[PDB]
Amino acid sequence: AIPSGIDLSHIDADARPQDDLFGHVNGRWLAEHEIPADRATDGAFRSLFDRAETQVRDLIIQASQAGAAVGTDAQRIGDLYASFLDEEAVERAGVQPLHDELATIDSAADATELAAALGTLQRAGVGGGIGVYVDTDSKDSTRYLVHFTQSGIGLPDESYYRDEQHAAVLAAYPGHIARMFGLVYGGESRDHAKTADRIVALETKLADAHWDVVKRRDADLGYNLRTFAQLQTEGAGFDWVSWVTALGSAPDAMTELVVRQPDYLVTFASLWASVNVEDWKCWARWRLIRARAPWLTRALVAEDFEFYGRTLTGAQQLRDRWKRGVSLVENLMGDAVGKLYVQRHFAKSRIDTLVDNLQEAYRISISELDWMTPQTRQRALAKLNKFTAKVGYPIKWRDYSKLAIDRDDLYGNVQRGYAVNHDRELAKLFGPVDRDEWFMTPQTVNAYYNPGMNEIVFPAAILQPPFFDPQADEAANYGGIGAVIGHEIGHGFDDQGAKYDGDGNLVDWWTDDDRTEFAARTKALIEQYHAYTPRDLVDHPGPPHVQGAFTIGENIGDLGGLSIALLAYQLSLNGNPAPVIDGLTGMQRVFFGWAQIWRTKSRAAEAIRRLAVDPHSPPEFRCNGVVRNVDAFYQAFDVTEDDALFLDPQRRVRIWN
Numbered sequence: 001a002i003p004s005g006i007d008l009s010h011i012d013a014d015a016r017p018q019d020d021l022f023g024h025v026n027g028r029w030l031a032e033h034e035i036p037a038d039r040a041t042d043g044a045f046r047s048l049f050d051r052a053e054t055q056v057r058d059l060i061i062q063a064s065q066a067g068a069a070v071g072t073d074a075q076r077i078g079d080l081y082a083s084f085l086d087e088e089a090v091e092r093a094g095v096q097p098l099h100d101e102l103a104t105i106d107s108a109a110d111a112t113e114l115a116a117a118l119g120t121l122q123r124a125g126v127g128g129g130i131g132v133y134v135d136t137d138s139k140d141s142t143r144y145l146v147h148f149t150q151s152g153i154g155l156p157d158e159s160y161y162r163d164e165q166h167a168a169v170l171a172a173y174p175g176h177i178a179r180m181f182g183l184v185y186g187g188e189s190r191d192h193a194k195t196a197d198r199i200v201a202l203e204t205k206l207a208d209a210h211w212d213v214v215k216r217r218d219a220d221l222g223y224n225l226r227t228f229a230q231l232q233t234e235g236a237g238f239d240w241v242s243w244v245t246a247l248g249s250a251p252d253a254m255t256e257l258v259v260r261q262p263d264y265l266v267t268f269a270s271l272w273a274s275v276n277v278e279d280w281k282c283w284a285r286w287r288l289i290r291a292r293a294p295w296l297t298r299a300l301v302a303e304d305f306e307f308y309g310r311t312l313t314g315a316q317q318l319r320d321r322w323k324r325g326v327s328l329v330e331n332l333m334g335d336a337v338g339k340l341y342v343q344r345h346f347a348k349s350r351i352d353t354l355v356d357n358l359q360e361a362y363r364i365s366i367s368e369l370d371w372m373t374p375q376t377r378q379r380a381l382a383k384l385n386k387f388t389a390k391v392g393y394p395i396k397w398r399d400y401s402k403l404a405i406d407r408d409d410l411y412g413n414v415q416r417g418y419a420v421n422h423d424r425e426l427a428k429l430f431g432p433v434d435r436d437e438w439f440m441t442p443q444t445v446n447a448y449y450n451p452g453m454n455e456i457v458f459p460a461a462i463l464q465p466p467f468f469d470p471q472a473d474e475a476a477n478y479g480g481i482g483a484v485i486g487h488e489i490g491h492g493f494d495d496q497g498a499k500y501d502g503d504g505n506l507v508d509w510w511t512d513d514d515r516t517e518f519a520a521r522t523k524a525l526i527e528q529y530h531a532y533t534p535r536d537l538v539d540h541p542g543p544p545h546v547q548g549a550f551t552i553g554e555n556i557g558d559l560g561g562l563s564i565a566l567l568a569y570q571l572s573l574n575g576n577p578a579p580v581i582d583g584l585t586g587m588q589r590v591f592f593g594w595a596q597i598w599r600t601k602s603r604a605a606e607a608i609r610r611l612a613v614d615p616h617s618p619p620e621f622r623c624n625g626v627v628r629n630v631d632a633f634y635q636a637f638d639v640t641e642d643d644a645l646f647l648d649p650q651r652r653v654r655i656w657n
C-alpha cells in the first residue's frame, strides 16, 4: 500500500473538525508535547530544522577534521566553528576583545566623530540608528539602490515602549542593561543605573518616531526616493558624509537612495544634534555590548539569554554550545555550508510538476473571477505568466576569498565575517542585477516570494515530509507543499504584491472599480482576523488579538494557497473519484494536510512577541481561519450553522477563490 502522508496518531477524537480542525488533527500533540527547555516554539518546522542542524553539524566536523589548506572554505568553516566551541579560550580572553571597538566610541569627542565610529561598527555587524540594506529599485527592477530603514531600539518593536501589553518586559529592560554594563566595566548593576535609564529614555524617543508594523509594510508609503544632497538638507544634524564613508562607500556609491521612513530619518538627525553626545555615547556602548554579548564570557552570555531568551520568549536554558556554533557558521558562511549540504542531501523534477499545476490552477481561477473586470483579469494573467520559479538550490555560489579565519580569534572572525558580507552587498551597487542570487540557503526550512524579480523560491529543505512525500498519495502533498506553493504565488497578488507588475516595478495595473472591490474584500478579511485570540491566550489582559491589518498579506497568501491547491488536486484526478485512505476522502486529506503542517505551539511570552512582530497569523488561525472561508471545507466535513467554525456564505471572503 501507498502511505497516506497524513499522521493520525495525534488526533483528538473529541474535538469535532467542524468545530476545530486544528484541534481535531493536532489535539493530542497540543495537549501533551513538552516544548524543549532551549526553545520557545516547537512543531513541524522545528522538527525539520533539528534534522538539518545535525546534518550541517556533521558537515562542519567532516570539513574540520579534513586537513584542508588554509585559504579554503573547508578551512574557514572548520576553524570558525572551533573558534566558538573552545569555550575555555574565550573565557580566558575575558572582556579584552571588546576593548578596541569600545575605545572607538569612548574616544569620540563629539557628534561628528561618533557618527564615524558608528559607521565602522555597523560595517562590522553592530546595530545603529539607521538600518541599511541593498535591494532593487521599486520603480526600476534593473538597478540596485541603498535603502535606509528605522532602527536604534533594543526591544522587538516600537510598541514595547508604550503599549501596556508589554509593560513587564519594559520594566525589566533597564535592570538588564545595567547588569550588562556591570559585567563589562566592573562594579554592580546599581552603579550603572543612571546609564541604563538614560539609554531607555533615548530609545523611547526613537520608538516614538518609528512607524508601526502596519504602516511599515505599505510599499507606496515606503518608497521615498531621495538624492544624497536632499538627505543632507532634509535630515540635517547628523553627519551623513563621515558616517557613510565609515560604512565603506561614497557620496559617489549611489547618488540616489531609498528612505523607507522619511519623518523618522528627520527626527533621528534632529535628536543627534539636540541630545547630549554623552547620552548618545551610552546608547552606542549598549548597541555594541548587545551585538557582541554571544561572543564573550559565560557570564555575559547567560545574562544576555536571561533577557533576550527567558523574558522575551520564555525559553528556559541556553542552547548547547554546538548549536550556537552552527548558527555562527550559518550567518557568516551559509552559502559555503549550503554547497556541501546539497551534494550530500538532495525529485526536483516532481516539484516542477506541482508548481506548474498550481500555476495552471491560478490561471483558471483568475479567468473566472466574477468580481473584477475583463480588463484587470487580463493584466492579472500577464503577471502570473511572468512568474519565475527557483527550486532546491542556487546556480552560483558566494565567494569567500576575501575572508580570513583564525581558529584562536572568535571575536576577530565575527568582525571580519560581517565586514565581508557587508562589502559584498555594497559592491552590488556598481554592477547590474543578479537574478541567479538566492536570499535563503538551501538548508533553510522556509520559502519566499520576491516581488522585484516576480519569483517564488523553494530551498531543498522544505521539500520533505510533512510537506512533500514522493511515496505518499498526492492529497497530502497538495495540502502541504502544494498549498505552500500556492501561498508564495499568492504573495504576488496580496494587498502589496499586487502593486508590482510582472517585471517587479511599482505600477498601478488596475482600474479604480477593481481597486475598490479589492479593498472591500481586504477590509472583510482584516476584520475577521482582528477578532481572533490565540486559544492559549484567552484569559490574558486585553485579551491579546491578532493584528488583522498586519497579517493581511499573509492571510491572503494562505487563503489563495489552499483554495487553489484544492482546485489543482481536483484537476489532477482527471474525473476519477479520489481514493479513500484511512477513513478519509481525498478532499478531507488535503485539509488534514494543511492542518498538520501548521502543527506548532508557543510559550505565552513568545506568542505575545509574535502577535506584535510576526506578519504570519498564529498557526491555529492559518489552519482554522482559512478553511471557514472555503466552500470545499463545508462540503468535506458537512459543516452547518450549528458548528463553531461556520460562517454564513454571505460573510465568507472570496478573493482569488
Ligand SMILES: CC(C)C[C@H](NP(=O)(O)O[C@@H]1O[C@@H](C)[C@H](O)[C@@H](O)[C@H]1O)C(=O)N[C@@H](Cc1c[nH]c2ccccc12)C(=O)O
Residues within 6 Å of the ligand: 041, 045, 046, 445, 446, 447, 448, 449, 484, 487, 488, 491, 554, 600, 615, 616
Ligand atoms: C508557507 C510557509 C511554509 C513559508 C512562508 N514564508 P513566506 O511567508 O513567503 O515569507 C516569510 O515571511 C516573510 C515575511 C519574510 O520576509 C520571508 O523572509 C519569509 O520568512 C511562511 O509562512 N513562513 C513562516 C513559517 C515558519 C517557517 N520557519 C518557522 C519556524 C518557526 C515558526 C514558524 C516558521 C515564517 O517565516 O515565520
Ligand SMILES: OCCN(CCO)CCO
Residues within 6 Å of the ligand: 613, 614, 615, 616
Ligand atoms: O522564521 C521565524 C519567525 N519569524 C517570522 C518572520 O519571517 C518571526 C520573527 O522573529
Ligand SMILES: [Cl-]
Residues within 6 Å of the ligand: 143, 144, 145, 428, 429, 430, 431
Ligand atoms: Cl545600481
Ligand SMILES: [Zn+2]
Residues within 6 Å of the ligand: 487, 491, 554, 557
Ligand atoms: Zn508569506
